[PDB]
Amino acid sequence: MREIVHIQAGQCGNQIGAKFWEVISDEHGIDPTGSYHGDSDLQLERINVYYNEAAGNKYVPRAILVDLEPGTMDSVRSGPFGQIFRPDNFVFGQSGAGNNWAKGHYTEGAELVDSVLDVVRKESESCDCLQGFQLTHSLGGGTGSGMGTLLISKIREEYPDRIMNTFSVVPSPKVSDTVVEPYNATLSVHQLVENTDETYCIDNEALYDICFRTLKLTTPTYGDLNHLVSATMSGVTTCLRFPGQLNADLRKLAVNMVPFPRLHFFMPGFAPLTSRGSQQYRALTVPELTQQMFDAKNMMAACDPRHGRYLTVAAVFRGRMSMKEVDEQMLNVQNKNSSYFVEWIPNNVKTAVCDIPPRGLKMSATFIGNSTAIQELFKRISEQFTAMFRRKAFLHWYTGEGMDEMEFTEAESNMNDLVSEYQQYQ
Amino acid sequence: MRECISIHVGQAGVQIGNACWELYCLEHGIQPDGQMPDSFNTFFSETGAGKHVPRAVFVDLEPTVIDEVRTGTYRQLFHPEQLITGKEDAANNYARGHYTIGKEIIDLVLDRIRKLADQCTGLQGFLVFHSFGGGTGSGFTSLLMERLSVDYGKKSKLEFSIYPAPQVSTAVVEPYNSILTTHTTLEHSDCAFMVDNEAIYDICRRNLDIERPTYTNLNRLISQIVSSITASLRFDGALNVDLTEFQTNLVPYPRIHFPLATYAPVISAEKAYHEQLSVAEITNACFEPANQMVKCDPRHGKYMACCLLYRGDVVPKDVNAAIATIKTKRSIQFVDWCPTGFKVGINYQPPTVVPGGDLAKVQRAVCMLSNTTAIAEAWARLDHKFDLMYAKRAFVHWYVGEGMEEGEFSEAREDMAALEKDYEEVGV
Amino acid sequence: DLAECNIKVMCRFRPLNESEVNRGDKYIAKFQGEDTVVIASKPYAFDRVFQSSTSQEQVYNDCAKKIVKDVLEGYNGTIFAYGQTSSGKTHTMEGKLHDPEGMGIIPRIVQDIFNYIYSMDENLEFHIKVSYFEIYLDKIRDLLDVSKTNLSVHEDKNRVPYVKGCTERFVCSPDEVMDTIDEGKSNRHVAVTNMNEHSSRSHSIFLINVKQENTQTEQKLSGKLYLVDLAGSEKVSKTGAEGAVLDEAKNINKSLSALGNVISALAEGSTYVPYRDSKMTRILQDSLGGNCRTTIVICCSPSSYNESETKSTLLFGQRAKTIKNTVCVNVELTAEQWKKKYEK
Amino acid sequence: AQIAKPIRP
Amino acid sequence: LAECNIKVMCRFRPLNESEVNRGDKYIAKFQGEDTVVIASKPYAFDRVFQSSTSQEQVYNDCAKKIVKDVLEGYNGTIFAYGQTSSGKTHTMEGKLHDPEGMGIIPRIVQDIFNYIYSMDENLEFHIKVSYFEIYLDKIRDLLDVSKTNLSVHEDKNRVPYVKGCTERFVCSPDEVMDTIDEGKSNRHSRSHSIFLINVKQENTQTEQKLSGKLYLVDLAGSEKINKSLSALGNVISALAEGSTYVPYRDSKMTRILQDSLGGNCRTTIVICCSPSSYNESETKSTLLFGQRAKTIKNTVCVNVELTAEQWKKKYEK
Ligand SMILES: CC(=O)O[C@H]1C(=O)[C@@]2(C)[C@H]([C@H](OC(=O)c3ccccc3)[C@]3(O)C[C@H](OC(=O)[C@H](O)[C@@H](NC(=O)c4ccccc4)c4ccccc4)C(C)=C1C3(C)C)[C@]1(OC(C)=O)CO[C@@H]1C[C@@H]2O
Ligand SMILES: Nc1nc2c(ncn2[C@@H]2O[C@H](COP(=O)(O)OP(=O)(O)OP(=O)(O)O)[C@@H](O)[C@H]2O)c(=O)[nH]1
Ligand SMILES: Nc1ncnc2c1ncn2[C@@H]1O[C@H](COP(=O)(O)OP(=O)(O)NP(=O)(O)O)[C@@H](O)[C@H]1O
Ligand SMILES: Nc1ncnc2c1ncn2[C@@H]1O[C@H](COP(=O)(O)OP(=O)(O)NP(=O)(O)O)[C@@H](O)[C@H]1O
Ligand SMILES: Nc1nc2c(ncn2[C@@H]2O[C@H](COP(=O)(O)OP(=O)(O)O)[C@@H](O)[C@H]2O)c(=O)[nH]1
Ligand SMILES: [Mg+2]
Ligand SMILES: [Mg+2]
Ligand SMILES: [Mg+2]
């Protein structure tokens, strides 16, 4: 009941989804072989949300792993939680996109999207009451951006009345991993804006900042960043899986947090986030959790919320806590930061409390923020796109796979319109 | 026999219902399994041997909380067909609760009510428990009230809603849902008792001296209020009061049926001693603005009708003295067209204390249900929030996209302006 | 080079119907003057308020007669009807296609455009192309080809949106246009509702492009004419929709709310002006805030059973009348003049 | 004036 | 470039019943297929048709090349010169609505429509017809009797053309057939009929437009007051002798076929003669006409124009 189909597209999506599934299985007491070794019945009460059943009390996740190269699929299979997945769900080609959005959306992704949609359709049909779709990808690459966008469009045209929440990794401002990030990101957002219900924007720069500042990690690796992302991915849908005093589904979050249809780009966050050797000094309470949540340092997007105003905020608390404490803390946060909140919306914050915390934590929280500050990311992406596109730089690679300059202009216009809409409500 | 049906819609309704049914089972000496080791026919049904089946219908589109009821300590108390669940929630959408997702279990709940209504000889009314603001507790309750009014109509209908608070709030689309539901259900309910979480939080902080009140405590307080309301049916006493008496003594005009409940004494065990808790003190503290369960000062308005439901060791002479002292006081303001705005009800059953509860064992308690014009300011602030959100037309696409014309918002706003105007007119 | 024009919003009141005259309903509309209507003692001023007895010829003459001349002169024109369920949009726009007295705006426009073409200067050569599609469940369907189940709205060099892939049929005689209209109407989606027995569940769009070339002066002009028949706002209590009709109603209401939002944005002088929230608002972007001379024919019911909807439609028409358009002649540069400019 | 229809095979 | 000869073909009709009643004999004799011998004097032509030859034969031998060349880029012209009642209506028009005859014009329009139906689909064709005739050096529109005594202006290139005549677009072979029938009905034969179709082939992919004009014209009698034929005999005498200062402007008949006579247009000429013996004098005059007409050589270039986008691009450089 209220099942979620999970899709991993590209290297970033796959290596984040693997951490996500390890985290979820640990939370629900599933050992890597697929057996159940938990301690509480609430783990099995709603195991149908993220898992299917099989003969022998073995639980298989309903995850669909897609890529245009088999290397990352082999890495996932060879991992510690790799044999939990269904061997039929691995759908892959043999020619990668090569960080070409056109290659992954028009030429190589088209040949694989049929089989991917077949697996998606089978998994959805096996579900009792489908709730939504979950996608992990990166906007800065070829297979992720392009293939995930094509799959999102196809699924949206196939299931128009279902939530499509995508956890995308946006290009970082200061350091660029690929030289064609602006093109891929603009072309991916041009379809994310139209074919998604709520997209969560994560950039590696904010993750590195969190790790070095709050977590005090000397050598942050991709595992730690994927782990921080998996924390908020699990925390977003905790009310679907465990009982709580005040429950909020994905659609409830979308209704509260999306005032206008095209403004569905969110900044996620997590709390508590302390360093070993500093937990004995902290005080785990709702005020401290809220102070951590609303801090600009704790955001996982490189868009400072101070340079903007919040439209809607969601606070999905976990554990045993007073509703009075939570509501008073939210009210005082809104009052003390009135300049950072929108005035034509009373009570910008939404609250959901789940009465089951993550293992080893007495309390936890996930912060979802719809801020006008996300326009800065789009503005810099559009600036880089214009700089690269006035001079036709790196453009024959995209044109050689069947794209046109008019598509680039339309994507840029859509990005500019989204920026203008965000600026209007500020 | 005098029998009532309880309907709990949405998460708030079902939580309050869990508290209320724990309280009732404690009052009547029924173990949670349904085995008693009269005066229970109002809320319970007797089977061939032992098992007492409560007259409740738990309805929610979310299956989670009804599943908690199904697996909780009160598992073998309710008839499993009474507990009704959906698949997907209303997601804080009035349209989902009313038009789209509501019209998939409405036939089931109506059939269950009819089956319960066929097992009662002297049906008296409905005790619908829901919450303003939520999608289910605003959309599904409106559809259910329409169906019940069309089907039964002559039978009474009482509501115990959770009104949105001024400052403390949870949802962001709460004003829309609240105005839509109180536009739709203004013509169907006969007496809608309203409470808000913020006033109960303040009551818990000051009187009960608990700095971290949660939903369980609020549900217990509301359960005590509803037990005080319905105690006249269950137990004996001097000046017993029925639900039709509530309607005929609390509703002056057909469009003015929004009283606010108040309870006294709400004290801890430490302060249970050191206090006399006399009838006069209880009544005076019950008329205090800080003890109101709705965030509105009654001093900014005039009382129309006020019914007092005393419990426990209460003598009518004490009640008369307390009423005289209240009437002589100048701060309380009664309207001109009501020379006598006091109805008194005395009962011999003292309030019961749930084990592991904040309330203390007291010999007497009161429940003040007053129809005052001070509730107009709550409507005013809710309408202000609605107007602010609707000027920019925010969140409207979610409601419009599930079977709701854009003009329904304007119609609801006009109806609310009319209700505010009616309250102002009756004030003068 | 700029000649600003407003929206020529005009109101049409249909007579009370059988289902409404036999159930205790009263004619609430009171008409004063020739351009204003009084409802609930609240004046509303429009360009022309047509009363219950107005024939199709009169509304066509006072609404769409100028649009043919404007299109053939070089400007862009667009007319779209608005209202609630069972209000008079299909009757005003198309009506009975083959009846000389009951035909609507579209057949009269096409006949007049052909007659004006015949009465033009001899040196002109005209190319006319007809497109006819609909918006059903947020999908652009071609009513002339069922294979095009859904289409897309792209943009041009000068940032104007247009439907891509729609069948463009060249025409020579009004008979061909009438056959196109008939074939399109056969495939348009209709449903049975309590308010209207032949209710339309799609936003039909009729497009004709008139390309005009002069042989002597080589000067070339183009004109785009949109004729849209929108669906009406519905209420589940009145319509009683269950099943597919409910989904159609949901999509129709969402699209109409988007259109109302864009009209309010134009009227208030906002900056974002949300054209991109729906397909219909995208297609009519240049119509509402660009290079088009647009007239809105709002249709209303005069009964007390539909007073709230009539007031909402009246407010929509009043707000639209204030918004302004920037209209210029579409003079496409010529090849001979291009080569002359190159040489000189 | 005249109206032209392209003859596309 | 390329130099192509103005073809000349000789056609013979069967002896008439009046001639066999009057006792006329068969003087002309056929020798081979590329000449005809009469009066013991060989006359060399490109091709000589027998008396009983079929009209499909002459169409296949003469006109099909004109059809394909006008379809691609090449202006064409075919006309008949001969004595009265020698057969220059059946040669050109024949039977308008009898499938057996379909002399030249109906067959050529059907063939051009078939060829249009064939070949690449990515091509836009705008074909325009315009039928007009002249009489006594007065140009008169044939599709509308209102127009009378028109004139000839000058286009961008040095090519005189009729100005003001109605040019009706046609889309189907039935339309061309009915417009030809109406034009012939509007004719009451000393008049010169000029039939022009302007097939304009525009390619969307290459943005290249090619305009072709075929002239299916018919002459008047040559019994020799007639003046246009005298200048027609003067212009060919200018062309055959090669003398400059050619009198193209002497008569208005030659002012329309100026590119057909020596310009950017590949043309063929047919002559009709009679084997009768009573008309020995007038028969030799038409025979010598075809021999001299072969002496002309014309230069043809593909009529190619650049689209509006192409001129814009050349301005950028
Ligand atoms: C002795 C003790 O209490 O140890 C704690 C601990 O010290 C702290 C510092 C933990 C620790 O976390 C980290 O150091 C960390 C490393 C990489 C990325 C993110 C965090 C901990 O490792 C993490 C671990 O978290 C869990 O057990 C949660 O269930 C968590 N699990 C995982 O992330 C996970 C890790 C490996 C394998 C499988 C799952 C979780 C959180 C949300 C949703 C699902 C699961 C906890 C409480 C601790 C340690 C062990 C030191 C903290 O993290 C979490 C996620 O709880 C860091 O700040 C918190 C506060 C904790 O007190
Ligand atoms: N007193 C009390 N109020 C509650 C409780 N739970 C939620 N509320 C209030 O109810 C409102 C939220 O509505 P809910 O009843 O949870 O929503 P719902 O009716 O279940 O509708 P959906 O969940 O959207 O299907 C908020 O104002 C909460 O403060 C509760 O247990 N007790
Ligand atoms: N001016 C009019 N005179 C007479 N009958 C009319 C007139 N306008 C509408 N009607 C009648 O009303 C019915 C049509 O409703 P119509 O006018 O078709 O509604 P509509 O606007 O197309 N409804 P909808 O598609 O839901 O927006 C027809 O059968 C008409 O005969
Ligand atoms: N090849 C032929 N076969 C049969 N009949 C023919 C042939 N050629 C000509 N005729 C007939 O002979 C006559 C001459 O025809 P026509 O073609 O009318 O002559 P013309 O040379 O056009 N005369 P004119 O226009 O007066 O200078 C007509 O009756 C024709 O039908
Ligand atoms: N957190 C994380 N980020 C990654 C990982 N792999 C790649 N990225 C980021 O993703 C972007 C590159 O896109 P990628 O997914 O590799 O291209 P694709 O395989 O064509 O989709 C860059 O910004 C990388 O830093 C990973 O394993 N973990
Ligand atoms: Mg709920
Ligand atoms: Mg219609
Ligand atoms: Mg002749």
Residue numbers in the entry:
A (entry chain B): 1 to 44, 47 to 360, 369 to 436
B (entry chain A): 1 to 37, 47 to 437
C (entry chain K): 3 to 346
D (entry chain t): 918 to 926
E (entry chain L): 4 to 191, 202 to 237, 254 to 346
What does the paper say about this structure?
Kinesin-1 (also known as conventional kinesin) is an essential ATP-driven molecular motor of the kinesin superfamily capable of processive movement as stepping dimers toward the (+)-end of polarized microtubules (MTs). Kif5 contains a N-terminal motor domain (also known as the head) that generates force and processive stepping via Mg2+-dependent ATP hydrolysis and exchange, multiple coiled-coil (CC) regions with breaks (stalk) that mediate dimerization, and an unstructured C-terminus (tail) involved in autoinhibition. Using engineered stalkless chimeric constructs of human Kif5, we present here MT-bound cryo-EM structures that explain key aspects of kinesin-1’s mechanochemical cycle and autoinhibition.
The fraction in the two-headed state was more abundant with AMPPNP (47% of the total) compared to ADP (26%). Although our construct contains a 24 amino acid-long tail region, a maximum of nine amino acids (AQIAKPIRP) could be modeled in the two-headed AMPPNP-Kif5bMoNeIAK structure. Sitting at the center of the pseudo-palindrome, K922 has the same location in the complex regardless of polarity with either I920 or I924 embedded in a hydrophobic pocket lined by I130 and F128 of strand β4, I119, Y120 and F116 of helix α2 and C174 of loop 8 of the motor domain. In the presence of AMPPNP, the MT-associated head of both single and two-headed Kif5bMoNeIAK states exhibited an extended helix α6 and docked neck linker coincident with closing of the nucleotide pocket around the ATP analog. In contrast to a processive dimer however, the 2nd head is not thrust forward onto the next αβ-tubulin binding site towards the MT plus end but is instead locked in a restricted orientation against the 1st head by the tail. Nonetheless, this revealed that while Mg2+-AMPPNP occupied the nucleotide pocket, helix α4 was not extended, and loops 9 and 11 were not well ordered, such that the 2nd head was not in a nucleotide-hydrolysis-competent conformation.
